[PDB]
Amino acid sequence: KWYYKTITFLPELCNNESLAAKCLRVLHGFNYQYETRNIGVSFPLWCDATVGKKISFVSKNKIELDLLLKQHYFVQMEQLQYFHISNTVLVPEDCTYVSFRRCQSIDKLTAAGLARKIRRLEKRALSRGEAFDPSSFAQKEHTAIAHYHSLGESSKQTNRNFRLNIRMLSEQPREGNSIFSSYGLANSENSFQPVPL
């Protein structure tokens, strides 16, 4: 038994990634005063490109979901007609169960990232033997990927502009209650807990 309060980015000229980034940034900023790992992310009309002009917030107990939209961020946005919000509607049991997992192995393929991986492998060569020759590696020739459709998150403790990127896999229409994470999530290392779209 789940509920959702949708937010629609209204004014018809908006880099939806830049909006969805800060919306998930304040969901990440949410649940740090209270260690609660309950709520999903639910991108409803995720297209081939340009993530859709609204976002649903399918949730757990619903004492959290309403509380999630009482953060004085969405309030301070609301005085200008930017967002339009719904009244916590029941999920119908006839719905698609898509998993919105942040892959994070996309940035194991960038040379800046592969430099990190080799440098790690070189530091933990203290598992003794022959200290491996760092000339025995090749960025393949055609490292081909789909689809990953990235956002624009930034770190808060440090001034590092990290970027998390979400995929759209679908299976097994019921799993756990919930387990999730700080960044909403459908990924957290144990459960592939899908989202009712």
């Binding site: 960038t110 040379a111 592969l114 430099a115 020739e141 055609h142 490292t143 789909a146």
Partner: protein
Amino acid sequence: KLPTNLAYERSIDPSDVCFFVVWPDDRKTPLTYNSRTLLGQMPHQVDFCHVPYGASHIECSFSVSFSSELRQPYKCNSSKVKQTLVQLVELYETKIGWTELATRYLMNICNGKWLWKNTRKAYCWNIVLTPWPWNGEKVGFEDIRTNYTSRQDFKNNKNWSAIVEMIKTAFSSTDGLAIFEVRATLHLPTNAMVRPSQVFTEKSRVFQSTTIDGERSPILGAFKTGAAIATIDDWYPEATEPLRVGRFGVHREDVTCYRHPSTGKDFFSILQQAEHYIEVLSANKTPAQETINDMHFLMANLIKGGMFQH
């Protein structure tokens, strides 16, 4: 004038700039890149070329050869403007020697101008060029940010007397020749961006590559690294920056062309006055504002020559 079949042949003949990675054990492997295409769930290929981890330095090897193919045109059609052009070049040869163009061509070889962007955020880079015909030792230019900046920094004792001359003989002596084999060592930082030449693809970022030791390597063009050592033209109405020696002194990154056919300082109005320019070189002395600065451009455009038909 412009007699319907007039063609000169280039004197500066550059090659491809083959990139190489030197490891700390003194063994040189060709620099290899990777090409990612995005297969959006139901073509657009982007290439990435960074310096691999634990690399000592980067070698950039190419060969430029100065020849004497500016004395006589390749096709003339009419032997009336022929002797005019042969007289014009040998008058320029005698009156105001080949020192200026030679030095200007040899500065942007011996300072790494042909690397274009790979010198940016680099600690130090050293250029060694082997000339021919030569009799002794390799001419080496050490760290070219601190030591060599201006002309006078290049005009030191044991290097510059004997390699600017041998370009002057290679332009004057009919069936004359000079072959410089240039080799630059970039000391780029840990996993820096290398910017090679990008191929056309009529409509993003797929490079020009050749196969060295069975595997592909980015190449930095042939007509790009020739258009780099001929970024010489700065005798255009006033002066801001050295341009590529075209006919209409065309700028690339900004999409305008200085030396318009309207301003009367482009290679077609300056050419057709040649018979006048033979006059002012006959007796002393040439005013070095409209004469020397135009004869420099005229000769600099003859070295890029072919074709001036109709």
